[PDB]
Amino acid sequence: MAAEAETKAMITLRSCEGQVFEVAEAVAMESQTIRHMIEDKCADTGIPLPNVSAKILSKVIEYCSKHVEARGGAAAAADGDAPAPAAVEANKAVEDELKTFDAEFVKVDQSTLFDLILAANYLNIKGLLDLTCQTVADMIKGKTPEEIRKTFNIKNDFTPEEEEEVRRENQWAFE
Amino acid sequence: SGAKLLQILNVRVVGSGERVVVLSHGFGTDQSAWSRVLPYLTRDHRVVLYDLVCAGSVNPDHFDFRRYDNLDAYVDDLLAILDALRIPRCAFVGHSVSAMIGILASIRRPDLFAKLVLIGASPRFLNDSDYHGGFELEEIQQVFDAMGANYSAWATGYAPLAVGADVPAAVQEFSRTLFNMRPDISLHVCQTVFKTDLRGVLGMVRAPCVVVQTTRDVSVPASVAAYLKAHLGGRTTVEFLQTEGHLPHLSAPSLLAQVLRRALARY
Amino acid sequence: MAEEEEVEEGRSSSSAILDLPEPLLLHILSFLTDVRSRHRAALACGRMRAAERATRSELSLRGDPRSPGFLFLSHAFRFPALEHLDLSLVSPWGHPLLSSVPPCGGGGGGAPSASSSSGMNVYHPEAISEQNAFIAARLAGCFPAVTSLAVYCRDPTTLANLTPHWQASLRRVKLVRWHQRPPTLPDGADLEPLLETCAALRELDLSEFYCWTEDVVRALTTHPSATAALTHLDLGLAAATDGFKSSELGPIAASCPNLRKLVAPCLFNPRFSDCVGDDALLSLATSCPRLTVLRLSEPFEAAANIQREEAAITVAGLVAFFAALPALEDFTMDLQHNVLEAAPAMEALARRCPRIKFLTLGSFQGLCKASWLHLDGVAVCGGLESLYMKNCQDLTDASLAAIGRGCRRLAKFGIHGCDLVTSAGIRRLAFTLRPTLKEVTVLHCRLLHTAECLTALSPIRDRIESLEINCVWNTEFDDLGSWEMLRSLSLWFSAGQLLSPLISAGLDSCPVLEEISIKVEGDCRTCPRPAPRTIFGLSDLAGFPVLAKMKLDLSEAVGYALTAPTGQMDLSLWERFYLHGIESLQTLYELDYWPPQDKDVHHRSLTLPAVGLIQRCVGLRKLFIHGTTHEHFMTFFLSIPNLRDMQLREDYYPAPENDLMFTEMRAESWLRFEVQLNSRQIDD
């Protein structure tokens, strides 16, 4: 008997402009919006993504496949027993690898990172969302509202009498 | 005015009794130096405590150097306080320069100071011809130099000398109050006090006087108590405590409280 | 001609984070915890200001709420989503808030001689209740969703004023009082308003709220309706009590069938008949079968020299108590008396409480012996992750190995008063629990000196994150790895001991060390005067790069605060000695200091040398002093560019009474100096 190769179910993805991506369903499993439609059995012909372009879709696919791979490679606990000290070390490395994968993953331009933020919400990929959502929080961390304004190319909209008043009202912020 | 001076000089009304007693603290101290002995008279007397203008508790901005170069302005503050308290008659217990203040006040207002109790009293500190104030001009100027060059070092070298008896709690309290003093104000008022000579006015003091003298006083020779009992015009008596030092209100509260309650029974 | 077709690149790119749907921004900033960055971003833009206002859950108001500046805040100062409200730090510190009791202004015992016409303050209760209601209404408007509330309660009138606005939602309450309990209050009256108003209460806290146990019994056992519904309780009472008695605890247990968490110091001294014996233990166990967190302690005084006496608790009682409460997961039982042979008790605990995770025992002897082919006592409780021990005089290295083989899930380890433990057993336990051990605590172990203990911790030195140690200095250069995960350190020092040897002992490179606490214990008066150039060695800690938070507790350091007899050293010089080199901490961001206490002075007063020492730490952002000081020292700190959060917390029982009689800090001076500090233009 020939060995039946386990066929990872492919879910067809059709981006906003018409480009198609072939991914495993387990990759498509992560995105809750994609997940939900999978069980709706409307994914036989492929699902439209009118709000996701090819580049953001490819990077989302990259992120989701990487995190699914990390989940699979994590040493699963043996039915209620705490993992052996070797197993703990193996899983700690995968997290560190996945976290390291995450940091440079959001090391993109603001627009792409902003685009990374939107897609994970539309795709309901919380892990990608949170990684991108907190990424902005760190790059705001340690900054005054002014260079924040330049960093996002925000024009300072406060009149001097307003900005003076608000700065003193919020004096317990910086200190 | 007296009323604002009450707030400025921390004038507070406690105790009960028809007998009104005025407590004034000494050098480098404040009215809380009487706390260890405050309860003993609160039962029998309506007690009045106030802070001198030189105390660090009062705003050092309020210290008028030029008016407070003489004990006269301090007597003025005391009298304005007492008039603000509508006191027509009271006894006075003074410590150190407060004794001179009370001497001058009873001279000025004999109608108010029924009886006087003196703890560590000295009308003059500089030794004179036939007068041992216990200090010479060189010693006083050396003290000035030690304090001006280093108020911290002088105060550390002075506070155990002032307290005398080996009571670290009293020495600590005096060190606290002395260090809360302001150096320029302190030099000014010490110059005010050492220069004060009330030997010519003790006989004008009409009120009966109670002198409290310790076994050993670094600044008060026992001959000073003899001079005080000799020259004060009022019927003057000297009570001797079986303890050494200048601030028995902090070191031996029991003995001094005994003496005071004996004295304040009637006046 | 035209020759003009090359200017079409000027479109302002918008910050797409603003283009995000608003709930997404709310979600993002739901993750932001640090209030500094929160309000920085809020100041970046108005839309972000609204987002940060809506994303706040907990808050501690700083300044005087009674001040009209807080009272007249605009509608923008609005926090609908604020859950946890902390009002215990409002200005002034230590004061009754919205208290209906009139101030005791010149009320000495004595009939007022009614011949005096000058400036008598006529009390107006109507106005007082008016401002109390208005401030409560303003607080409710700013903070409508408060369910867990912390407040300083000098008197229950504060509680009566505050409860109606949040009684429907308030489920946890924290009461604060370091000042003396008002003697005129009826027994249990401090707690009655809450037992009467807040039906939603589910957790109660009184660990630091000074009061009598009898008040607790009265208020609780006479309010069974509320007590049947509570879920969490703490009874520390500022640890100013000798401990609850059995007769007090009993009816409490009766009125409360539904508790889950308890913390309570209790009278465990067997010489008292009303001590907590096994009978009280099982009565509590039966009364509250659903309990999950229990932290029980025997209050003691330092004069109790080596408590060799036994406790009123037997191993059989322990076993039965374990059986009666299957739902336990956190347990703390600290005694000064010794419980012998409690290993079978520990076995019954493991069997009857398989969910046991946190264990804390004091003076329990013979818990783990490894004296049989099988693991014994605590060595069987393999599901344990937390383990702290006090006064285990007979714990051995073989016991350590048995525990490590059994408690392979142990993450935090601690021993106190374990004289028989050597560096060999410590190193064995560290190696065995190396993947899991992350925290280790060693205090006052006689054989375990600093260098030996640091050497024995090499296997987990790369993994260890927090460390607590009492420093005992004795009278190839292998590369000892940097403390790569060690972010926190706790230090215990004898009076006069030097911090400098710590760096040499093995603690030199801690790149991730963020916070540290140093405790100095001992009578400095009996200690010989060190040389005038001797310092503690605070500058020696500058080698830690992310060192930001400091907690130097010297309140236990008792000395002649202001003058020592000839040959001894005053607390002014002691402050100079200990605080010297603090300015070396470049990243020093937070400092928590305890002024040393003199027995003769109710106050832990700060001296000027300490003022000068601290004033030069420009990087200090936060400064919390646990005492009092002179008003003339205050203006120095305005020179520090960056400090705001400064409050003299006399948070030690008894909190001294501040009534116009002390040269130390005054309330009006405090308010005007807060105006001074918030008047400085600050960095952003």
Numbering used by the authors:
A (entry chain B): 1 to 175
B (entry chain C): 52 to 318
C (entry chain A): 1 to 475, 512 to 720
Task: Reproduce the article's own wording on this structure.
Strigolactones (SLs) play fundamental roles in regulating plant architecture, which is a major factor determining crop yield. The perception and signal transduction of SLs require the formation of a complex containing the receptor DWARF14 (D14), an F-box protein D3 and a transcriptional regulator D53 in an SL-dependent manner. When the SL level is low, D53 interacts with the transcriptional repressor TOPLESS through its EAR motif and inhibits downstream gene expression. D53 belongs to the AAA+ ATPase family and comprises four distinct domains: the N-terminal region, the D1 ATPase domain, the bridge M domain and the D2 ATPase domain.
Here, we found that apo-D53 was rather flexible and reconstituted the holo-complex containing D53, S-phase kinase-associated protein 1 (SKP1), D3 and D14 with rac-GR24. The cryo-electron microscopy (cryo-EM) structure of SKP1−D3−D14 in the presence of D53 was analyzed and superimposed on the crystal structure of ASK1−D3−AtD14 without D53. After 3D classification, a subset of 42,499 particles remained and was used for reconstruction, yielding a final cryo-EM map with a resolution of 7.09Å estimated by the gold Fourier shell correlation standard. D14, D3 and SKP1 had good fits to the refined map. Unfortunately, front, tilted and side views of the cryo-EM map did not reveal the location of D53. Unfortunately, D53 was too flexible to capture in a certain form, and the electron density information was lost during average and classification processing. No large conformational rearrangement was observed between the structures of the two complexes. Compared with the ASK1−D3−AtD14 complex, D14 in the SKP1−D3−D14 complex was flipped away from D3 at ∼9Å. Although the density does not have enough details to allow for accurate fitting of the SKP1−D3−D14 structure and the approximate 9Å rotation may relate to the difference in D14 proteins from rice and Arabidopsis, the local conformational differences are still possibly associated with the formation of holo-complex. The protected regions of D14 and D3 mainly lie around the interfaces of D14 and D3 in the SKP1−D3−D14 complex, suggesting that D53 may also bind the interfaces of D14 and D3 in a manner dependent on the SL-induced D14−D3 assembly.
